Design a protein around this ligand. Structure first.
Ligand SMILES: *[C@@H]1O[C@H](CO)[C@@H](O)[C@H](O)[C@H]1NC(C)=O
Ligand SMILES: *[C@@H]1O[C@H](CO)[C@@H](O)[C@H](O)[C@H]1NC(C)=O
Ligand SMILES: *[C@@H]1O[C@H](CO)[C@@H](O)[C@H](O)[C@H]1NC(C)=O
Lengths: 226, 224, 224
């Protein structure tokens, strides 16, 4: 009998821009006459929940609450609790979610790496990496754009934040993408954009193409008696 | 009343070449004098395990048995069963474990990338990455060999065998490694040793130095 | 009246991954109803011995069989026993074999050399050499590779572990590989891979090709 609470997430906030908070209840029998409500840091009235979920595959009930908040009061570090009154449990279950933060903040650093040439020999596909390092906290967002139109999410894949061995509590992440060498050997910018809270504009991007090196080759033809 | 066992992983094997099967008896009341045992497919007796574990600080007792077999037998697939006997446990319990032979077999193609040029400006650190793509099945093992002696795994980080979006039956992995700039500027071939059970010798290596990949600037042509 | 066996060897382990044991008989009059007993140090027996050989054509006798033991026992030092029974003498003939551990475990050093300049003028064949030096004991198991495809062992020849002239406790070997010049003129990376027991991963490979001898900084030319 445990209740999982999801605070607002950076990825959903940036993608949908319809900030939502939801806590789901687990390990409860398939009963009814159970109401779920949300409370703020002051425990004020909230919005009615919608989109009731179906029971778990192992024959236990499940439900999700819905409400709306704002960044101006979420960022203050205040707590948020959802009230669940299960029929079986006389004591209602309350879960608290907030953001203590107050941690060493720093801007993420973004680097792109062009595909290796030994991959660019069999002439099937190439992979481009976008390494985001030295950022705290977690909940960063990455997506790839080709000439303005974002790529279909089924194409690229992203890692998950993990600690840095040479930095106390500073995270790290990866992101790769595959394009045909047919397209690569012609031209495209393939921008990688990262959305993190610590950035001054919250958004930075860095792009790379096939012609980003070639440091001014030189040809000399000494001629004698010819 | 949770029973589990840890089959010997590929990394567990190659880390010490000391394949061994252990049983996880956790989420039970803290007790003493607990008996764990194994068996073969035909019911033959097993070797005398020892070096049992202790209780968790979370009011839980962990029992670990050290059962050792040979890699030939384990690959042949001798079906084992962790039998745990204790005063509190009412009845014996059985668990079956093996490998589902019949998986797709493919060779992991390894590509090695140098650090970013824009990173090599702060003169602080570099992150060389070892990308292993298009293998089958999972559980690949990667280590970082500078030259000669190996390096501790507390200073480099490895990903998990995440599935490849383009290749479903195939997978991929990422292994990074930090180093100060002065070490990157005096050689340090920094090879990446990766071992998978589909390569003919089960081990392969790749190397990349700072003076690698640089194109040919001059094209002198003496004329006479 | 002498009986000599064949201990398992490092190269025979890597060449087949089908380890066996063979104990041979010689200097005894040919006979029948001769059985060789295969019991371990602890006294228990092993799988039967097959492939009964034919007596040597020099008025002597021989017998060979097959076994299967995982290398954990051999590394631990489990003394295998081949008790041949002969009608020449009533007392059974018992012999055992083992391995020592008092050996310097230095690592081998591998160098490749390209074909001679004058050989690449007659335009018929070329020979490429892989050299090993400075190891102990005698466990080289050197083989060749191209494009990830193993080559037939007929095309390359390996030498014995000849000792060093100066170094007292070190040995060396050699290996050549004949190859067509027109094939050698278009890539064919042609790596050689050694496998000793003092190597941390027990496998090491080096490679050389045509482009191995270029400054990768400039391309001088002579046009007329
Ligand atoms: C390089 O120099 C040679 C000699 O002058 C000349 O024949 C050749 O065309 C030059 N290559 C380029 C790309 O200019
Ligand atoms: C280098 O010069 C040679 C002639 O000396 C020419 O064949 C070749 O195309 C040149 N390389 C490039 C990249 O143009
Ligand atoms: C260098 O010159 C030789 C001789 O003309 C030519 O075969 C070779 O392709 C050249 N290399 C490059 C990179 O142009």
């Amino acid at each position: 009998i445990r209740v999982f609470a999801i605070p607002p997430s950076f990825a959903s906030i940036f993608l949908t821009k319809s900030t939502k908070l939801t806590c789901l209840v687990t390990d409860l029998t398939t009963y009814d006459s159970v109401t779920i409500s949300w409370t703020r840091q002051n425990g004020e009235a909230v919005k009615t929940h919608t989109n009731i979920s179906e029971s778990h595959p192992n024959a236990t009930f499940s439900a999700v609450g819905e409400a709306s908040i704002c960044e101006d009061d979420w960022n203050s570090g205040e707590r948020f609790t959802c009230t669940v009154t299960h029929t079986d449990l006389p004591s209602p279950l309350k879960q608290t979610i907030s953001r203590p933060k107050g941690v060493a903040l720093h801007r993420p650093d973004v680097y792109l790496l062009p595909p290796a040439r030994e991959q660019l020999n069999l002439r099937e596909s190439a992979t481009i990496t976008c390494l985001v390092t030295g950022f705290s906290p977690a909940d960063v967002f990455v997506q790839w754009m080709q000439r303005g139109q974002p790529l279909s999410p089924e194409k690229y894949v992203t890692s998950a934040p993990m600690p840095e061995p040479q930095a106390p509590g500073r995270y790290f992440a990866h992101s790769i993408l595959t394009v045909s060498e047919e397209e690569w050997n012609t031209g495209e910018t393939y921008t990688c954009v990262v959305a993190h809270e610590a950035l001054p504009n919250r958004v930075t991007e860095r792009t790379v193409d096939k012609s980003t090196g070639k440091p001014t080759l030189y040809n000399v033809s000494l001629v004698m008696s010819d």
